[PDB]
Amino acid sequence: IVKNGEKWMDRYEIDSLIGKGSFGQVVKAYDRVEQEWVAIKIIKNKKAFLNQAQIEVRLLELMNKHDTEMKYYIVHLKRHFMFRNHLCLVFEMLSYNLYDLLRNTNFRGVSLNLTRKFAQQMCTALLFLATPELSIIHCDLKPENILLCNPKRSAIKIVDFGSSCQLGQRIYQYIQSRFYRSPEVLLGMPYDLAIDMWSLGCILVEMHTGEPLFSGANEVDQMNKIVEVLGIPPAHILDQAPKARKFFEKLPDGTWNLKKTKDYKPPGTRKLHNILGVETGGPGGRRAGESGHTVADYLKFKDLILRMLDYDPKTRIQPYYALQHSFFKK
Ligand SMILES: Nc1cc(-c2ccc3occc3c2)ccn1
Ligand SMILES: [Cl-]
Ligand SMILES: [Cl-]
């Protein structure tokens, strides 16, 4: 839609394409007023994308009118305007995303120490979104949506509030990227901020192993891969779940089991202990003997992840309590 060298509103000079989304495109541009480069998110000229992007603008502006040390893990929306019938969101420039970081490791993962730094910033971000007057559910956390602030540094920010909603302003039943989709969403249940913490747990294991924890090809495969690691979800959750019978079957004695199709490891036998290599030199043993990768370091990480992957969104660890975990103690 946009040429390089093109000038908008005697303010912005378009340089190049940064990225394309379902929403439209992101371009690098020079702002002559501030005298800085910015990223402009250009929404498609169609009602569906316009209306959802108007929600993104509202939630970013809501976040910006809160000045607390907790808010600086969200990309900064500088302003927005309408141009040629496209809503245009102007952000600060950021660097490459955590998927690019994994790709750059040949999908062998970053160190437990770099994983910890990401975890601590993401947990702080989620604590900010949980502030009562915000209560923002990101709904699409994944490596692609976490960007480095600076290619020399390990500071990150979350981008893409395109799926996001406040608690009690849910639109879609089917949300989150499948690999990072919470059990409560797979099961058709009303969701709250705890779905982001599920995504985060998935993301942190992936950042350290190089590979997605739960790479379902569809929702049935997704839930089966979750069950391999974490077992059958508890009956009290399945009993209240609209879509339990998409994946599970209830038995005479009021118990639940997998529906099986034609031929997964038996429920709960694919141990996070072994995925992480807690006692076997880390993922594929590639961290054997490296500092900051002892059994004790690993056990703390495993414990925090298993708390983030609680099936029960009620007892799943919350951002403040995640920040107090031993994994983050020097
Ligand atoms: N909210 C939002 C923000 C971005 C965004 C914002 C700044 C950026 O700098 C480099 C890439 C990049 C992408 C993309 C999509 N949604
Ligand atoms: Cl991915
Ligand atoms: Cl979504």
Side-chain angles (χ1 to χ4, degrees), residues 4-46 48-207:
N4 316 326
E6 201 170 293
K7 317 231 160 155
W8 295 10
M9 288 152 46
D10 308 318
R11 185 177 185 162
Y12 305 105
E13 184 181 341
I14 310 306
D15 177 81
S16 47
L17 175 60
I18 296 175
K20 292 190 165 308
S22 42
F23 50 76
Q25 63 202 51
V26 178
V27 299
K28 179 178 162 173
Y30 184 70
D31 178 3
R32 309 151 54 185
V33 168
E34 288 298 313
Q35 290 181 134
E36 66 189 8
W37 294 88
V38 298
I40 305 182
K41 184 186 197 169
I42 304 170
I43 311 295
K44 296 159 159 175
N45 48 1
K46 303 296 182 323
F49 299 110
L50 169 67
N51 293 159
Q52 192 61 49
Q54 291 163 147
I55 302 177
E56 185 176 17
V57 172
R58 187 175 73 244
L59 301 175
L60 292 160
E61 282 183 345
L62 200 53
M63 291 184 267
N64 284 157
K65 68 177 230 216
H66 276 248
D67 29 29
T68 87
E69 65 282 322
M70 231 141 51
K71 80 140 161 230
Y72 307 97
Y73 298 107
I74 312 304
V75 64
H76 185 220
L77 180 71
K78 283 164 179 287
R79 67 217 141 253
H80 66 269
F81 56 86
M82 296 283 253
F83 187 64
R84 324 157 112 167
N85 208 225
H86 303 258
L87 182 51
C88 291
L89 286 67
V90 180
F91 302 94
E92 62 181 313
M93 195 65 55
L94 299 174
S95 194
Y96 63 91
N97 70 49
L98 260 42
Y99 191 63
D100 300 312
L101 183 64
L102 280 181
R103 195 186 297 96
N104 294 175
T105 73
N106 294 310
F107 299 106
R108 286 170 231 169
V110 300
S111 71
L112 197 51
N113 291 345
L114 185 52
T115 299
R116 185 175 302 103
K117 293 177 197 159
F118 292 152
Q120 192 172 238
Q121 299 173 73
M122 288 299 291
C123 280
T124 304
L126 289 194
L127 183 51
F128 174 69
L129 294 182
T131 67
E133 324 92 72
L134 295 182
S135 298
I136 291 171
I137 319 167
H138 186 279
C139 298
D140 198 15
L141 288 180
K142 68 196 191 156
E144 297 86 322
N145 276 342
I146 307 167
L147 273 64
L148 289 171
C149 298
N150 183 321
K152 285 197 182 165
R153 317 286 167 203
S154 59
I156 54 178
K157 284 185 181 183
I158 303 170
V159 304
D160 186 2
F161 281 80
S163 304
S164 311
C165 68
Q166 289 180 285
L167 190 62
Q169 304 290 319
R170 297 188 312 286
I171 297 180
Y172 302 117
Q173 165 277 131
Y174 190 88
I175 56 152
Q176 307 192 274
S177 301
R178 183 179 329 106
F179 295 175
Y180 311 99
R181 186 174 302 142
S182 64
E184 59 266 40
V185 175
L186 287 161
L187 286 169
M189 320 178 68
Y191 53 79
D192 65 19
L193 279 73
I195 72 173
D196 287 338
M197 185 61 67
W198 177 277
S199 301
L200 181 54
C202 292
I203 291 163
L204 294 172
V205 171
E206 172 167 12
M207 290 315 293

